[PDB]
Amino acid sequence: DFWAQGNETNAEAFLLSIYNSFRNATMSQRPFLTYSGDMRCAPITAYSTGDKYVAYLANNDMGELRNTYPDDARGGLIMQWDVFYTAIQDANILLAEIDKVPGMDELKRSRFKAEAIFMRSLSYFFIVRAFGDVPYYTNAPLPRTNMVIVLQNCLADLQPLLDDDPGAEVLPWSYSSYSSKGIRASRGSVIALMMHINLWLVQFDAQNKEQYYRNVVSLGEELERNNGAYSLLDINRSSVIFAGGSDEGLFEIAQNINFNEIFMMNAKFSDNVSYSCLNKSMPLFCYSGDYLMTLFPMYEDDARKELWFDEKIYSTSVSSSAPKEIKKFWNIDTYGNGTITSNSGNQIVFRYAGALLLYAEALAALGTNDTKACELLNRVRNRAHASEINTSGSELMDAIFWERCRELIGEGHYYYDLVRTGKVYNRNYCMNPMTRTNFNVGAWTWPIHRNALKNNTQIGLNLFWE
Template structure:
């Protein structure tokens, strides 16, 4: 219980670790921020842009967005000791996709705010702010800002807007789509594959206006770069490939091309860190990071609802506790880490004496080097990183068939080589696709990708990949989505909610 105290400090954002990021016009309305009296200097654009990332953190880290993305339909089970002592039903609600039960549960929602996830209002506030930036940065006199910087700020606004749409599509499916800064029309929901295609088209126009790297090290990975743009586009393409069957090869080819650009043109801005550098990776701001949300205990940025909760309060409950809240189901760990096969990640992230045991003593140590105090996680929350993009490119190549198989294997073995584990040497197409899926599962474990990988690949329908699969009929009716808050219907006759959750 005492380790839940850190959830109280969620209001601290990027601001203290980056110049100008404080919510800067506390007595000035958004209308004035978008008016002619504000957009006068480059400093104005910088303040407004920095504030966008604080708004993103406000949305994502005041509920359990990342925690839910890891546990939902996942490979975990609540331990008997946890059930007996604490009575934590939210684990079971997530694993068995009982979101109605999850949001009706009262006590733990007071800590984790799962019932806030259906409300998309915060996402649209950020989308509107991004549109204002795109619209108004051109109003700054050319004597105050360079043309290059204007293009970069507009590209940042485009990235933020499309990132938020991507997050919403994965949560809700179809969403209302607009790009105007002062939009006030009544509209319904747009088919989510069309939303992502619109986002991809816009990103293609602006991605090259983002730098590969920033000169200020404090901006590294916490402000979108060209690498961030490419990673976002890769994820969008792979998501659409899972739902737009007739055009899937188009999306796979686009992902391959984007991955090639990221790996071959980054000029040294990005690389895979070595296993000995993993602690630096999860501190944030490394060459492997593509986009991160900053947090630093020394600056008072204490957030408890990101993926670090998996490590800090769940799988490794604490010294002397004698039990964990949840454990991995052993058969899935064996799929990722076959018995007797060396893997540095296994050595660094698990206790070899407990990792396969389905009991109360599981320890997951991936982020253990980021403990800033007894109650705080001191390290950036990594949203996209280089290894993630490499494995997406490997997956896309594998899906394109025999002509791309060798490249898929090469990319897969880049990640395996870094982990000092056995190279993949098979030739069966289905086996290769599975190998890449399980490589993503273990490489990205705890980072909030698990549920979405199950959904977009439709492996969530199969008990070979998750402990509580969704049926085909339920999946088609939207069981993979979240409910949408009833407030979306207010004064909008065109709006519909997700029927599966009605």
């Protein structure tokens, strides 16, 4: 009925409910993205020890996180994949039913299908990164499917979106409407996701890593056919990047304060690392000054130092009396009854600087063109007014890893980059590492909440936490 007697407008509303569910899973009903991607194994300390989840995340004490916060948005909810599966199941429905909509525009029909496939793939990717093996279905009780299979099947679903649409008509490179720009899947969204999926396959299906890296290079070459749709904004216009809808964004989760589409405060990295614009005496947490002295060396130029951090960047104080904040994302606004957020912007899931660094990373790992890898890296270095890098081999691979840590701080990549590179168990790259043995038995995953077992009797838990 909804479909067979529907129309483009109702099909689009249904598609937008898929985006809504993904937003709920990541930002609006759970602080999933920032807990799982920024905070976990990060060298961070709470200003108030009563905020126990900060240390638990820092220390990978995920079992104590689940005992202290069993059901709520500081732990247990994040351990539930239910909201991502709402997105997945609605994508499955749209794909099964949309051909029934009488006489709608066929370009729009093809676009909505492409967007639904993208969002399904993005949801599966996000839950694989958090949970490991996950139940896999595309039919509108199943066991957990091998994460390598899930990732490979996602890649297979996404590839045709590029190959069948050589003109970027069904998914354009970018949208000119503010109602779509950054927040509806584009060709660039698809490319970035595929690069991430390949790089996860490098870690977890390593026997085929040469092919996955080659895939990322291929994807980079395609990204660079965007003909000026994407660009790196000036570093002094950083707030324009993080507001959302900029020419640097590749995929973003929409926030719209005026329309009551508001992320949880605790879900927004910015709101956890700011105080002066929020009428608070200190933020939720801060980064080690030693870490930031490593990350942003004091004797080398880098405009991110001045523009993204306050003057206490290197402070080793974790004192209430001497707080420090990160100002990278500031786009301050108020809503409801006087509630202030430091970041009214979209959450930037993938952006062009990140994708250029992934392209560089893959090239450097293949060892086939270190000069081009440097060129890519240096586009990001030059935008930050940091020194150009001219190196090769292991030094180049390290440079690109550390550059992603500098460039993407607070955007939900830190922990996940550590996992997919194996650096999460290496003290040379992570201040709060886990052990390699613990990694090998699944200590990089989140616990799976018992609610997942009610919903599906064929599900085994993540046993490191059991």
